[PDB]
Design a protein around this ligand. Structure first.
Ligand code: ERG
Ligand code: ERG
Lengths: 280, 281
C-alpha cells in the first residue's frame, strides 16, 4: 500500500543513493544497484528498508519527509523481526541486505535521539544477522566476513597488532581458549582496513561471534567484555575518521561515546544489552 | 497505485528508455532523467510512463493487460483535461507524454486492431497541436521540429522535390504565394534529415506542426492539401517498416497502416484523416 512518493523514493535510490554506498568503499555495484532493487519486490521487508534509507538521504535536500523516514523504519523493523521467525533460503540475502541498510540508516538517523530508538533498530538488525550467520557460500553477501597470525613459538597468542595493550592481562591465550576465535577474527579484520567492504566487515562483527564466546559475553564475563571494548575502539575510530566520506556516518561521534561508561542509557553493561539479544 | 506501479517505474528506468534511445533518438538526459523527474510533478505524464513500460513488460511478464489499459485511459483523460489549462511550466510534461502515448499506442495496435489506438493518438496529436510552437527554451524544441533552398534559383518556383516528386507532380510550379509552400518545404527538409538523430520524432510531430492556414484548409477536404498529406503518409509508412525491424514498439504497424488509405478499416481516406486530426476547440 504505497503512494506516489514511494516511486520517487525508489527512483532516488536507484539513481543517487546506492552510488554513495559504493563510494565510501563498498564493492559490487551489481548487488547494490541491481540485486537489491530486484529483491525488494519480493520481500516487503527489504523494500521498507530501502525506502526508509533513501528518504533519510533525501531528507538532506528535500523537506517534509520526516514521517516517511520514521514510518518506514518502523515497518522495516517490524517486518524484519517477524521475518527472522521464519528464515527460508531465498529470503536470506534479502534479510542480510536489509540488515545492513537498517544499520546505515540508523546511524544516519542517530540525531542524538535518546539513543534508545536508533539503538533498538540496530538491535533488530543484529539479531537478524546473527540468526542467518553462517551464510551459505552461495551468498553474494558472503564477503561481509573474512577468512580464518595469532600464537607464536609457544603455541599461545603472545601478541596481537589489533590492540596489544588492550587485552594484555589475557596474554598469553591457549588454543583451547574460548577467546581464541574472536581475537583472531578481530585481529584479522583489523589488518584489513585498506580493502573493499571493510565497513561491512566491521559492521557484521558483533553478529558473527561464535555462540560459545557470545553466550559467555552475555554473562558479563570480563575477558570477553574487554575483548569487545577493543572492537569498539576500532568501530568508533573507523567511523569518526570517515564521517566526511560517508554521508550516513555523520555525527556518529556524538552518539558513540569515547568511554563506554559514559553510555547514556546506563552503563557499559547496559550498552551491550541494548545492542545484543534476539528475542526467544 | 501499488507495488507493480513501483516495479514499473523501475522497469522504465532500467529497460524501457534505453530502447527509446536505441531506435535513433538523442538526449538520454531527457528520457532517463528529465522525464522521470517531471513525472513526479505531473500525474498525466506519470500514467503515460507506467502504461508505456507495462506495455514493454507485457511482452514477457503476463497479466498487465489490465495495467496497460488502465494507465492509458487515465493519461488520456488528465492529458485532455490538461490542454484546457496549458502553462509554460507543464508544457514539456505535455509534449513528453504526447510522444510517450504515441509510442505506447503504436506498440498496442495489433495485426488487425480497431479504433482505440487511433483514439489515443488523436489525443496526443491534438495536445501537440495546441502547444506548438514550443518556446526555443524547451528541451523538446529541436527534438520534434525542422527556407529558400527548396525553390529553383533559376525559375523562382518549386520545380522539383525529392520524396514526393512523382506523387505530387500535378501541384508543380509551387509559387511563394501558395499555402502549400510551408508544408512542402517542411516535408522536403524532413526527408533531407532521415539518418540524423530524432528523425522518428520529427516524423511523428509533423501532423501537429502544420500551419493553421494549411490545416484549416486540409480539414475542408481540399484536394491539394490532401494529396500532400498522402506524401507524408508514404514517408511515415515507409520509415516504420524498416525500423520496425529495429524498434520493438513499431512492430506490426504495417498491419495497421495500409498502403492505400482507401483501405482504412474505419472509412474512406477522408475519415482516416478525421479520426487522427481534430480536437476539442
Ligand atoms: C552500529 C552497528 C555497527 C552495530 C552492529 C554495532 C553497535 C556497537 C556500538 C555495539 C555492538 C556490541 C556492543 C558492545 C558489546 C559488548 C560490550 C561489553 C561491555 O562490557 C561494554 C559495552 C560493550 C563494549 C558494547 C558497546 C556497544 C557495542 C560495541
Ligand atoms: C502515428 C502518429 C505519428 C500520428 C501523428 C500519425 C498518424 C497518421 C497515420 C495520420 C496523420 C494524418 C493522417 C492523414 C491526413 C490527411 C489525409 C488525407 C486524406 O485524403 C487521406 C487520408 C490522410 C492522408 C490521413 C492518413 C492518416 C494520417 C497520415
Amino acid at each position: 500500500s504505497l503512494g506516489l512518493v514511494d516511486l520517487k523514493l525508489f527512483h532516488h535510490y536507484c539513481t543517487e543513493v546506492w552510488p554513495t554506498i559504493i563510494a565510501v568503499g563498498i564493492s559490487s555495484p551489481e548487488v547494490w544497484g541491481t540485486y537489491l532493487p530486484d529483491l525488494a519486490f519480493k520481500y516487503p521487508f527489504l523494500m521498507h528498508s530501502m525506502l526508509a534509507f533513501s528518504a533519510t538521504h533525501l531528507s538532506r535536500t528535500q523537506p517534509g519527509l520526516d514521517d516517511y523516514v520514521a514510518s518506514h523504519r518502523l515497518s522495516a523493523l517490524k517486518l524484519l523481526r517477524e521475518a527472522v521467525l521464519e528464515i527460508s533460503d531465498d529470503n536470506t540475502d534479502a534479510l542480510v541486505a536489509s540488515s545492513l541498510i537498517l544499520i546505515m540508516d540508523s546511524l544516519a538517523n542517530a540525531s542524538n535521539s535518546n539513543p534508545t530508538a536508533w539503538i533498538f533498530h540496530v538491535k533488530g538488525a543484529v539479531t537478524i544477522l546473527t540468526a542467518v550467520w553462517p551464510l551459505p557460500e552461495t551468498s553474494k553477501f558472503y564477503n561481509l566476513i573474512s577468512v580464518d597470525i595469532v600464537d607464536k613459538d609457544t603455541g599461545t597468542i603472545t601478541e596481537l597488532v589489533c590492540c596489544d595493550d588492550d587485552i594484555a592481562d589475557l596474554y598469553p591465550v591457549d588454543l583451547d581458549s574460548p577467546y581464541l576465535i574472536t581475537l583472531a577474527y578481530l585481529d584479522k579484520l583489523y589488518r584489513e582496513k585498506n580493502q573493499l567492504d571493510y565497513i561491512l566487515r566491521v559492521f557484521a562483527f558483533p553478529a558473527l561471534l561464535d555462540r560459545t564466546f557470545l553466550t559467555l559475553l552475555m554473562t558479563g564475563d570480563l575477558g570477553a567484555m574487554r575483548i569487545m571494548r577493543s572492537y569498539y575502539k576500532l568501530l568508533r575510530n573507523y567511523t569518526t575518521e570517515i564521517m566526511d566520506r560517508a554521508w550516513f556516518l555523520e555525527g556518529v561521534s556524538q552518539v558513540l561515546p569515547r568511554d563506554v561508561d559514559d553510555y547514556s542509557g546506563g552503563g557499559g553493561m547496559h550498552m551491550m544489552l541494548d545492542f545484543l539479544g534476539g528475542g526467544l
